[PDB]
DNA sequence: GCATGCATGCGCATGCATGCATAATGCATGCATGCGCATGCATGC
Ligand SMILES: Nc1ncnc2c1ncn2[C@@H]1O[C@H](COP(=O)(O)OP(=O)(O)OP(=O)(O)O)[C@@H](O)[C@H]1O
Ligand SMILES: [Mg+2]
Ligand SMILES: [Zn+2]
């Protein structure tokens with residue numbers, strides 16, 4: 001006889017029920033503790049409805065049930081549910097008021113083949129698969145214990161159990177003996193949670209030359225909404241045919257359709273630690289060095305992205321004057337400078353970050369529209385990436401390639417911080433409180449130092465004016481820097497084969513610190529110094545007009561304040577002090593100067609050396625001087641000789657003179673500094689020379 | 693009874709739905725009047741005798 | 742005139758032609774709209 005035939009009869013049913021009850025009551029762990037005791041207790045503490053059982057323990061304790069389990073799942077699961085309900089109701093008597101049924105789910109199993117191997121042999125069996133979710137139908141109320149109203153009299157027919165295979169068709173009304181019709185009593189019916197899922201093979205495991213295959217699954221009761229589309233899951237289920245409509249009859253061959261019915265899915269002190277890290281005096285440098293571990297160099301960009309991530313504070317006196325606190329970032333770089341890796345890292349770190357590209361065929365669009373979704377076939381209003389990132393970050397790649405509509409939408413979202421829609425009878429305004437970070441390339445493919453930033457970029461001045469921070473990444477042949485970058489790249493390639501800052505914080509710790517600072521830190525400007533700010537602003541405007549190009553405006557000051565707030569948010573300071581103000585001054589001055597052309601940039605850099613030297617390193621400046629002299633000598637050698645020489649040498653007197661011009665008189669510490677050795681410089685006193 | 697927020701994206705045209713109906717017999721032309729319909733999206737089945 | 746016969750008369754059973762009562766479910770068709778394609782018009786540079 002078949003396994004299910006022996007299962008059906010009452011004798012072994014009751015015997016197996018008693019065996020399972022004893023297994024539940026007597027099962028203990030490897031340490032002697034009653035597993036089901038603690039399990040049912042923690043289930044009781046939250047009023048849950050499901051119980052989890054391992055096939056390994058079930059096979060170890062009672063082998064016959066484990067053997068019969070794969071080839072007769074439905075009846076055995078029903079018996080186990082009855083036994084578990086009896087045991088639980090014995091433990092606690094109140095569930096008759098709360099929950100009248102408890103489900104039993106199998107957790108572990110011997111792994112079963114993938115979606116390709118499922119064939120006729122696996123029908124009506126227990127299987128376990130792994131796949132990727134592609135769609136979900138939501139939550140649906142299915143019938144259970146249906147009550148029907150007669151339509152001739154008004155009698156209420158008793159509850160009928162709704163099986164998953166066929167619909168319930170009542171025979172006749174017990175009183176008037178009518179044959180129909182009947183309708184469902186909506187008020188007295190009981191309902192169940194139902195959801196449908198489509199699963200596709202993981203693209204990495206598909207052999208070359210064939211395509212991934214998909215199958216459908218059904219989740220019920222507590223399993224609903226346990227998976228998001230695009231995730232990777234593992235199911236334990238029943239491979240089924242016996243549902244009405246599976247046979248193809250209207251035309252074609254007699255082909256059956258298969259469906260899987262699933263029953264399991266397998267995918268305080270921190271505040272004190274945050275405060276302790278804040279107590280450390282150099283937390284700011286730790287955070288600055290913690291950004292983008294995989295990218296070498298570009299320390300200024302990481303420092304700016306720190307403020308961009310931490311953000312500021314909006315201010316709106318009354319309902320009249322709105323001032324944002326989001327610090328936008330724009331990057332312009334020559335090819336090969338890894339602009340996109342920064343955006344990828346930011347998306348990885350940020351809790352809510354949206355990524356899109358202006359070139360085309362983006363997964364998420366940049367404009368709101370109303371459409372019937374291709375997958376769910378529903379009439380939806382799909383807002384752009386700007387709307388979806390409320391209090392989040394929006395990332396745009398290939399900023400220049402955007403067409404007219406994208407530029408218009410971005411301008412509207414940046415200047416008004418709201419998106420207006422008038423389409424298909426729908427008129428709306430949606431909030432776009434988001435921070436914008438963008439990357440782009442110059443017009444000719446290479447940055448021109450003799451032209452302004454606006455002349456080098458395809459964008460317009462109004463769009464550029466919105467961004468608080470502008471960064472320029474220019475590629476220049478430095479042998480030592482190129483050597484280090486190549487070393488890092490080759491090391492990364494070798495490592496991933498299949499066979500200044502003391503210590504950066506952990507990524508999860510950084511996330512927790514960011515969340516805590518955003519939630520509970522609100523620095524106050526009650527200690528600002530207006531005299532110094534006003535004097536510096538006046539002097540900056542004066543010398544900008546003296547040079548005669550791109551004068552400063554009040555907007556920059558606002559950015560400074562925001563940056564100051566961001567810095568005060570880094571140290572968990574509740575009040576703004578002079579250090580944050582000076583750092584924001586340095587950042588704003590660097591951003592403003594870097595956008596000028598050669599002569600103006602040089603003059604401004606020379607004149608404003610006082611402010612730009614805040615918390616700077618003298619050794620770095622001396623290294624810059626040495627690099628400039630080395631570059632001059634190398635250029636002269638290449639132009640005259642026609643080829644480079646084997647050695648580079650430079651007198652110490654020129655370096656000393658330039659340091660005196662910058663008011664530096666001692667260089668022994670620079671000689672003993674690590675920066676001197678890192679660039680493979682040497683100093684010879686026998687000739688008073690520097691060799692590289 | 694539930695309370696729920698949302699945003700409206702589509703609204704169909706206003707139509708007519710019956711709450712009281714009356715039917716007539718083919719042969720003797722007798723009438724059944726003032727039959728109450730149910731509220732909501734629910735239908736009604738005519739008698740056969 | 743009294744004794745007897747008896748054609749008439751009445752009520753309840755069965756047999757047989759007409760007549761009376763019953764009574765939802767499953768399958769097909771046209772309207773709305775997505776998706777791939779080629780022609781063609783209009784707009785730049
Ligand atoms: N400093 C760096 N550290 C690590 N990798 C780098 C660095 N600079 C460049 N790369 C590598 O250079 C490659 C260039 O590709 P990438 O997408 O990063 O370029 P991009 O700057 O976005 O260029 P494009 O202007 O063409 O969009 C990448 O594989 C990146 O890892
Ligand atoms: Mg790129
Ligand atoms: Zn009835």
Ligand SMILES: [Zn+2]
Pocket residue numbers: 717718719720721722
């Ligand atoms: Zn009639």
